[PDB]
Write a protein that binds this ligand. Sequence first.
Ligand SMILES: O=C(O)Cc1c[nH]c2ccccc12
Ligand SMILES: O=C(O)Cc1c[nH]c2ccccc12
Ligand code: NA
Ligand code: NA
Lengths: 419, 419
Amino acid sequence: QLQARRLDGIDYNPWVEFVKLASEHDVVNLGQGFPDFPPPDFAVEAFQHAVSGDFMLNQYTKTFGYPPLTKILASFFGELLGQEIDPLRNVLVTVGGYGALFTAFQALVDEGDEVIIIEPFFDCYEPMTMMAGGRPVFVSLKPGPIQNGELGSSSNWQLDPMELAGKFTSRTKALVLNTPNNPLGKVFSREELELVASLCQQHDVVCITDEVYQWMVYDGHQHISIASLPGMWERTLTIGSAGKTFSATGWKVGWVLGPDHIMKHLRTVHQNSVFHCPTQSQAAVAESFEREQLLFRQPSSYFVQFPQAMQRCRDHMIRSLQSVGLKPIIPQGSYFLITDISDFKRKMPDLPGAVDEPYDRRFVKWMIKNKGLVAIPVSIFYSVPHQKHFDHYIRFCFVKDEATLQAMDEKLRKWKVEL
Amino acid sequence: QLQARRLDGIDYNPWVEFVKLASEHDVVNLGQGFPDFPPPDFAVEAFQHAVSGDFMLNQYTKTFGYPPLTKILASFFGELLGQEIDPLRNVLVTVGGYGALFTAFQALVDEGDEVIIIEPFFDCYEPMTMMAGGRPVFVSLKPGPIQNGELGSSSNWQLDPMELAGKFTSRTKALVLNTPNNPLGKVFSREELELVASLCQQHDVVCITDEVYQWMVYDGHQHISIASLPGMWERTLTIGSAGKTFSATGWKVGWVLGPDHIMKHLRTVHQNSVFHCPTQSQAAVAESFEREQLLFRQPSSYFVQFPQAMQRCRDHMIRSLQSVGLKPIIPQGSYFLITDISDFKRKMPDLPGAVDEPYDRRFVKWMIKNKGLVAIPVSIFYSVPHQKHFDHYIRFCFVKDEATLQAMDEKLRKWKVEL
Ligand SMILES: O=C(O)Cc1c[nH]c2ccccc12
Ligand SMILES: O=C(O)Cc1c[nH]c2ccccc12
Ligand code: NA
Ligand code: NA
């Protein structure tokens, strides 16, 4: 073989496929998990300052992070986590939340280890486990009963304690937690986190916690970081994304926070893979966090204003999608909501596609080509054996400009007449 | 073990002790392998434009590269290599030349594979081979004869054809070629490349070619890309660095060029590790290459002016360093020259050090502390078994501001005249 065996079974990527398909048709693109409006002025200005300031910012910075960035990460997140964070020993700056995940898997996961992943899961957790020689083990959130003409809530998708406990074994190396969850929008409760924490402590397992949507919480729901829970700092790696934090996904800056005895291994991966992150975007992100720490909890701060604005976009989309019979599950956080399409599957089962092909994939192609709306089939966030059973949801992104939502409504009005 | 075994023996960075010692003293830092002056105005302005233009440049771009960048990389390097290059199939944008290297090793190198590495080598080739489960196989360039009258030339460090041929086995997966070479500054001749090409073809080996210093060639020496040789495109990966190209090392943008049947595997690694490179730095790099393509081979082009300027810096450093008995080997390319310190070893054989610490490492420490000049011991660019023999060279970087070269001369004045 030319190629390494570690690449077995991970050459296909759904986003590569889906982005190509959407670009081939005239659509309102609610599949894109990023803003189509500008980042806040302070953030764009921060990047402008970084590229017009000290000329030496054009040259390499320190391997484990631009010092002003590690300093503010350690200060701000130390406060949030109720933890003393050493910028040199407990912070690593990475190429996005994505690179941070990769660094964690490559540092800790070895041949034969099991990694527990919670369905629905941000799809990369599976192939990253595989590339590191790990065996993915899946626990599935249980959609709650929906009654009295109500919409479901993401909060009511349950992490069953018996199910979760049954997935832990002597071979479990890590559990991957994503809260707020992409694609579902669930914000894990203290009780749910205590369940995860108790089992990670009992089995001596590391929790890799993907908290990129930390600030995107709605309806009074509170983000809780599992690393802040008793006994968890010493066994947790906490991941964030500047892009998802500051509505600047193209900046691709992320970080991992955690204890030195774990972090030293991620540093080893980092020094042997990218070595440096870009200097100037780090400077921009540091300046942006400084601004938010200064205004923390104040009504003028982005972390207060932006979630409030996006909650209005969420509510708008929830109302609109119902007009054509899609059934939203109300999210408590993230950029996303999912809609149940089971009524469509029942009444329009015979959409064309491959003999094995999940209904949601076929529905999304139908909707793009005939209705001019893009969504993401939720089955890509499920293990293959479960895709045939979770093929009746699709994911929309509501973090969009007013004009995009109006364009969405135009499409929905046309559909509604065609029902 | 908490950590994965792939990290075995790759946690140490032998640079670090020198960076730390340098920071503790009043030094002229000729160890840093990057400019201490600004990038050219057109490059800095390109980045400024990218962060103050289309607001959507703040969001994600395409996974395998920002299209305007892959477009110009394909056209510009297609011309240079005499090769039809498709942006989508044959170009991958990466996190620097370093990320490009990592991506190639992770795609291709597997347990039980051998990788041929040419000494002195850019130090990461060894641990990257190790992390991917490969066995590094080392072949040393051998300096040709030079008398007490004249200086050696990098061109005269020879790759013995029969030595090289004997390194090849049924297990050889890749050969890593770095031209122009860091630390030595050798520019491989057409003859030397034809030899490498012949053995790679005979044994069905992939040539990973690190060409970050492409533009930094001196004394009328020409950069030849091995991928341009007959039959080589189908078995070569060619790596470049925006940072080394535009004197903007903190930008950390690189690329790999190659045939689809190999590139698809690097795409698999990429999509499962970083997914996106940052958008705006890619826009800046595209704009910078457009500028240089327009002015290709013209007197006003950076690719003509800059290496001419740096040749003058090289010449200044070669003369200056001889004042204290250092013996430069004249480089034909790169940012670097090495000096033989054998005369110091003879006169001052006993220097403070650890057990089996190579003389050059002890000498650099002595020089930093006592003379205020930083260099890099060349033994870090050798396999451990060969460090005993190649213990008497140190690396200087001459890509420095005129003020820095003046400051070098002040340190040399003090070395000669004081005490
Ligand atoms: O959920 C999203 O839309 C964001 C997203 C999709 N594929 C990705 C790959 C890398 C980083 C983020 C994403
Ligand atoms: O040779 C140099 O000084 C440049 C250099 C040393 N270590 C490095 C790691 C990544 C990228 C560049 C370098
Ligand atoms: Na255990
Ligand atoms: Na062979």
